[PDB]
Amino acid sequence: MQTIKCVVVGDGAVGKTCLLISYTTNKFPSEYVPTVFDNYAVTVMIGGEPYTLGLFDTAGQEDYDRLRPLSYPQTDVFLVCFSVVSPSSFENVKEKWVPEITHHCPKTPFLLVGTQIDLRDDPSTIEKLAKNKQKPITPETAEKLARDLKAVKYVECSALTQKGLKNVFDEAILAALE
Template structure:
């Protein structure tokens, strides 16, 4: 595992796509004292064969083509995908050291198409937090947050917190997008609309971003790291957010 002691004064997130040849990186955070060890779920990871590692699971859901995969790829690679390929299932992971305790943070991408409605919930068990995504250029995907996605995740995982994420904010003021929506007597989803829905549905928070420009992209995952169910130790609740967010630059390749 990549072990690197780095200051958290300028945190940079980094997640690696899981593969048989790529071990999970290890990230060290500087906290005043180690976290107490108690968690209902544990996993074993390479580099910590003698340690029990606590797992944190985040699942990303939402309509097809709203930018869920672009969200993860842009965040983890700093590159924007050149073409759209519908996702069936994909996952990313990072090992985070909080005090002396290792955590595995997993991000799970899912397919939004109706064809996968029966397959998708197989990724829901033991989820700690959901990212429920919609495109700000698609009022239909926004309405589906209320009509489909919140009912679905709360049916399978009652009580698990959700963050509502508005994607593709770089297109909100695009003339062609506004013209296309205008012909249907619609407008892009406003930030206030997202915040109102989050309050009505009891979401942890509404956040929005652009995977293309990376505007507010990091903020989305900062919120994931600080979602209520992820604070596995009461001590963490009193820490500043930047002390919980992982900090690691991508490993250098020769």
């Protein structure tokens, strides 16, 4: 209902949260920005409305080890990001999260996204897909997967260029409490 558990998911990339800022301004050069860790477990109170919150990031002590015993993603809402220029990659999540069912019933929301897409949509890198699959994956087609497997929303982000990825989190916030 309100309990939301969000973390940085995907196929093995940087903490997706380190980008929420890159879209804001610190990008990825050498500026000054808040630190990695992010452990919050509490409920907000607005107008008398309690909000269930729950999230956590690596580096429990700057060693990136306090958060190393994870070996298991346990957060209803997962922010995963993949690229639309891989060898039959999108076809692997159709048979991974849909046949497996998130929790086998709740079908928790899945914020689907595109990694470094800000170019991936051009007909030049698109060339690489041909060497393996001439059928590239597009946003207008992945939506059917979310509406077919009951996901939450297909979005896109570009850590540095800023693919307006604010919608990847903004739409996972209201879908987390569902």
